Amino acid sequence: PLIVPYNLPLPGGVVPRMLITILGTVKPNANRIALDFQRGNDVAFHFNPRFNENNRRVIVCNTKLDNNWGREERQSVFPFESGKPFKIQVLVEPDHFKVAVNDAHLLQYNHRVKKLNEISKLGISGDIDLTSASYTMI
């Protein structure tokens, strides 16, 4: 059991070929999950499953610069299930973050924040029990 919200330092920032794996279980009656890859106060990549946005389940991705959110990218494929265990993998590629859930590709997010070495912290929050959060190089 790790405590949420959880902050995973990414020493030296992210680099292509870095793979981040997050294991946990979605709570009963979850409303949201969030991963926030941060560059200081900015959020380079916000990954936000929403379980009930106007009775729809959607994933919202965005970037926050100077305290302002940008243009949302939305995905209607929704692989999370209330009460059930999940695995999120985030692979950093040269031009985008690639996200897979439960070993199935979900989405890509093109890099808006381009100083990858300065994205040095991952925040994990929301309605989950967090089992493991780690990284490796592939």
The CATH number of whichever domain residue 62 belongs to comes to 2.60.120.200
Q: Please report, in range form, the residues annotated as the binding site.
A: 69-75
Q: Please, which experimental method was used?
A: X-ray
Domain count, the chain: 1
Report angle CA 16, 14, 43 to the nearest 5 degrees.
125
Task: Say how far apart CA 17 and CA 14 lie, in whole Å.
Answer: 9
Q: Please report, in range form, the residues annotated as the binding site for a beta-D-galactoside.
A: 69-75
Structural domain for 17, as ranges: 1-138
Using only C-alpha atoms, the chain has a radius of gyration, in whole angstroms, of: 14
Residue closest to 15 by CA, chosen among 100, 91, 79: 91
Strand order in the sheet with 85-92: 104-110, 96-101, 85-92, 18-26, 128-137
Resolution (A): 1.1
